[PDB]
Amino acid sequence: NSCSLSISSPDPVTYTIPTDKGDKYINFKLDVPDPRCKALGGTVYFWGADTRDGKLVMKKGQDKYTLMTTYGGAVQQQLGGGYGYYHVSQKTPPQTISGVVSKNVGYKPGQYTVELTGFFSLNDNKQANPTPSSLTSKAAGKNIVSSTGTITIS
Numbered sequence: 001n002s003c004s005l006s007i008s009s010p011d012p013v014t015y016t017i018p019t020d021k022g023d024k025y026i027n028f029k030l031d032v033p034d035p036r037c038k039a040l041g042g043t044v045y046f047w048g049a050d051t052r053d054g055k056l057v058m059k060k061g062q063d064k065y066t067l068m069t070t071y072g073g074a075v076q077q078q079l080g081g082g083y084g085y086y087h088v089s090q091k092t093p094p095q096t097i098s099g100v101v102s103k104n105v106g107y108k109p110g111q112y113t114v115e116l117t118g119f120f121s122l123n124d125n126k127q128a129n130p131t132p133s134s135l136t137s138k139a140a141g142k143n144i145v146s147s148t149g150t151i152t153i154s
Contacts, residue, residue, distance in 0.1 A: 002143065003037030005030040005044060005120045006094065009149025012111050016154055020106035025072070026056065026151050030118045031094030037122055041129040042088030044095045045138070046071070046118030053082040056099040058112035058151045065107060069099035085132065088120070095120075101151065112151045119144045 008029040015024045032042045047054040048069060055069030070081040073096030080086075086095060097118055101107070119142055123130035138144060 001034060001037045001122065001124055003032050003034050003120065003122055004143035004145050005032045005118050007116060007118055007145055007147035009114070009116075009147065012150030012152035014152050014154055015101055015107075017106055021103045023101055023103035025098035025100055026114055026149060028097040028099070028116050028118065028147070028149055029094055030097055032088065032120045035090035037120075038088050038092060039090035039127045040123040041126075042092065042095075043085040043121045043130045043132065044088065044097075044118065045083065045085055045121055045135060046097055046116055047082050048099075048114065048116050050082075055082055056114045056116055058101065058107070058114055058153070060110050060112045063110070063112070065102065065105070065112075067100060067102045071097040071099070073098060083132075083135070085121070087129065090127075099151075107153045109153045112153065114149045114151055115146065116149065117144055117146045
């Protein structure tokens with residue numbers, strides 16, 4: 001089938017910097033419709049502009065910062081981030097992506113924008129687990145989505 005993951009970031013996340021290393025996660029609400037597409041395993045693959053592989057970047061105006069974004073939500077244990085996929089069933093809820101700020105920095109206050117993709121690798125006709133090798137042609141044929149959320153530094 002032909003399906004994609006939603007991207008809904010619910011307003012800027014409030015980054016509390018109590019001790020600089022406070023750290024917080026920015027939530028992007030991803031969701032794949034049609035249980036038929038989800039039945040494959042609806043593997044969640046996302047990437048932004050982070051410095052490691054591409055995860056997320058907080059940017060406002062001319063201030064873009066690359067942070068190590070590793071997501072949770074429903075991720076398998078902790079194997080997340082770029083190429084961090086989970087096993088979605090036809091009855092699995094939307095997949096939430098969480099972005100982690102460079103807590104080694106302690107950025108300056110501001111409402112930054114975070115760019116994220118987050119498609120699901122669809123296999124069709126299997127109902128078990130999609131092929132991660134399909135990521136090699138990610139932009140080709142696959143319904144890669146992209147949105148921009150927000151991070152309020154505090």
